[PDB]
Design a protein around this ligand. Structure first.
Ligand SMILES: *[C@@H]1O[C@H](CO)[C@@H](O)[C@H](O)[C@H]1NC(C)=O
Ligand SMILES: [Cl-]
Lengths: 198, 222, 216
């Protein structure tokens, strides 16, 4: 009878940076997805591997709720088979993803006059991330021949960059809050179901 | 020293009867006529009529058809009854005393009409239902601090606010009410106190909405 | 209208103010007994004096001799003379007479005593209490007081941008001591409140802008 704590994820005052994206495990509850897509407060609401039409009729072993903030025009990358700084170096979905990606513009909350420099993303990495991989290292990135060591220098970049989130930015560069729901259906009894399922 | 005290404020349904009582106490050296006077939201004044100690009455010709005044000398009280009321009768109602002055053989004159007044009572004529307020504490954020409480969504006016059952009077600023597009009123009352008392002094705002017979005491803590 | 007084009158301190009460055309002012009352906000009116003529009049006990009555038959008007006007004479002044079996008053003349000094507003902004949020409602209360003159502009800002929806602002009214106070209410949904970094009440008065800000 207990409902899933979607409010603890969607209605969270704090959202992590994308490079350090947050994940929460949801289990043993009823996920009334009707409450989600009925709300007109999401700029994007895209499901993969399952029609949203009948979300509330399905069960899953476990559901993971990943959340972070990214640039508005970077919301395109939170999807299977996409490329870019985010998908390559910060948050990667598997090619056969089953779940939904929900986003909404959080300019009124995450921007700042002069700039909110606490939301960072990874600029460089020696190789793309694997799906659902999280890279928080701050070690200097060697872009050239010289093997630099702990000193910012020519072709030796500090791997993270701050978004300059300001209220006045164009819509494309405004902060957006995204929560990825992954529907984990293993070979075990499902512990999260919708309201109108058998 | 005379003191006129009018009955409490309230709401009257359209076409029903408005009734008020003035209670008199204090020095009464002479002979007096007693009167009701109402004041409109725009501060216009209109005399309704007066009544003698004997019970004889003289009414305003424009209200005579709906007004009854009466006196209970034994209780030092006189009353007003105004029937078939409408929204035009929404007003602050005052009782007032006027002394008898020079009396010739054929006439007594009132030289100083309306010697003494009550504080006035707001009577609201309206079809709508009384509604008690929702009281919300306004928690306290130099060395002084501001705290208060919010009196929201009541009808009709007025509402009285005190602090600590009136024991706290200095620094108490109760603001005039605002009227919302819903027809309900809201006001706020704030008290300025030294921050040194926030951890030791109890602050409790007393809200009294007579028209709804509502009394709320809200403790306002840090 | 049996009795007509001007809506407002302004006079300098130490000056004299001649408050007029013009009787309707078909009623001769020469014979009439006129009565004048002073009312300050929050109090009932207060008898000042009767005036019929220089020989028939009445001055209430404790009423300054600075108050005197006269009549102007030309204008068919009664006059309340306030000599050496003071700041504490600021009030609404009513003329009254008996006519057609009833006391009738004029509309009241509000006296403005000029030369009161400026006073900067005190502004306090309260966020929605947890109780109200818990009740699925949200009100910001901005209280402004202790200012003169009473011309105030109040603006609300969600984050750093203007907001006009959901605003209720009272008309500034003189508290005791002849200063002014005013209230402004901004109603929000709990969601509007929690999805913004902050809200601001901005009060501009006499070349200065006080801004308080609250956030969750
Ligand atoms: C977040 O709170 C709003 C009410 O402010 C509610 O309608 C919504 O359902 C909540 N989010 C979730 C995921 O339940
Ligand atoms: Cl009596």
């Amino acid at each position: 009878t207990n409902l899933c704590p979607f409010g603890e994820v969607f209605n969270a005052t704090r959202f992590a940076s994308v490079y350090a994206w947050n994940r929460k495990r949801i289990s043993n509850c009823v996920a009334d997805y009707s409450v989600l897509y009925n709300s007109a407060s999401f700029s994007t609401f895209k499901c993969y591997g399952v029609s949203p039409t009948k979300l509330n009729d399905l069960c899953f072993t476990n559901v993971y709720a990943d959340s972070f903030v990214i640039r508005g025009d970077e919301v395109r990358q939170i999807a299977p088979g996409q490329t870019g700084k985010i998908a390559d170096y910060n948050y990667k979905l598997p090619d056969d993803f089953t779940g939904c990606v929900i986003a909404w513009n959080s300019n009124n909350l995450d921007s700042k006059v002069g700039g909110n420099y606490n939301y960072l993303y990874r600029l460089f990495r020696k190789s793309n991330l694997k799906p659902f991989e999280r890279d928080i290292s701050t070690e200097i990135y060697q872009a050239g021949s010289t093997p630099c060591n702990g000193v910012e220098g020519f072709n030796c970049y500090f791997p993270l960059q701050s978004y300059g989130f300001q209220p006045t930015n164009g819509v494309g560069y405004q902060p957006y809050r995204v929560v990825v729901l992954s529907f984990e259906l293993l070979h075990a009894p499902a512990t999260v179901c919708g309201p109108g399922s058998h | 020293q005379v003191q006129l005290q009018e009955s409490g404020p309230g709401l009257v349904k359209p076409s029903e009867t408005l009734s008020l009582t003035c209670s008199v106490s204090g020095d009464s050296i002479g002979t007096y006529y007693w009167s009701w006077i109402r004041q409109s939201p725009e501060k216009g004044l209109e005399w309704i009529g007066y009544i003698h100690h004997s019970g004889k009455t003289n009414y305003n010709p424009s209200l005579k058809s709906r007004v009854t005044m009466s006196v209970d000398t034994s209780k030092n009280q006189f009353s007003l009854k105004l029937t078939s009321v409408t929204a035009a009768d929404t007003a602050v109602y005052y009782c007032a005393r006027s002394p008898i002055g020079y009396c010739s053989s054929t006439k007594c004159y009132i030289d100083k009409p309306f010697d003494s007044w009550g504080q006035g009572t707001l009577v609201t004529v309206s079809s709508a239902s009384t509604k008690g307020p929702s009281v919300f504490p306004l928690a306290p954020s130099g060395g002084t601090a501001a705290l208060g409480c919010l009196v929201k969504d009541y009808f009709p006016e007025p509402v009285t606010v005190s602090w600590n059952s009136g024991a706290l009077t200095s620094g108490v600023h109760t603001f005039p009410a605002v009227l919302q597009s819903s027809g309900l009123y809201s006001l706020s009352s704030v008290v300025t106190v030294p921050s040194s008392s926030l951890g030791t002094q109890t602050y409790i705002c007393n809200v009294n909405h007579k028209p709804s017979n509502t009394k709320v005491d809200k403790r306002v803590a840090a | 209208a049996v009795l007509t007084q001007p809506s407002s009158l302004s006079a300098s301190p130490g000056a004299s103010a001649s408050l007029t009460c013009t009787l309707r055309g078909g009623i001769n002012v020469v014979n009439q007994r006129l009565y004048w009352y002073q009312q300050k906000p929050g109090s009932p009116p207060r008898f000042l004096l009767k005036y019929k003529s220089d020989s028939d009049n009445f001055l209430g006990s404790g009423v300054p001799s600075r108050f005197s009555g006269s009549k102007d038959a030309s204008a068919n008007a009664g006059i309340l003379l306030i000599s050496e006007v003071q700041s504490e004479d600021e009030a609404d002044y009513y003329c009254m007479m008996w006519h057609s079996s009833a006391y009738v008053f004029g509309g009241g003349t509000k006296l403005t005593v000029l030369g009161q000094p400026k006073a900067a507003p005190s502004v306090t902004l309260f966020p929605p209490s947890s109780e109200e949020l818990q009740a699925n409602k949200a009100t910001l209360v901005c209280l402004i007081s202790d200012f003169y003159p009473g011309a105030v502009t109040v603006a609300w800002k969600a984050d750093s941008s203007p907001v006009k929806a959901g605003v209720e602002t009272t008309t500034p009214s003189k508290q005791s001591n002849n200063k002014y106070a005013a209230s402004s209410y901004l109603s929000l949904t709990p969601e509007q409140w929690k999805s913004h970094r902050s809200y601001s009440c901005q009060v501009t008065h006499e070349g200065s802008t006080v801004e308080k800000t609250v956030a969750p």
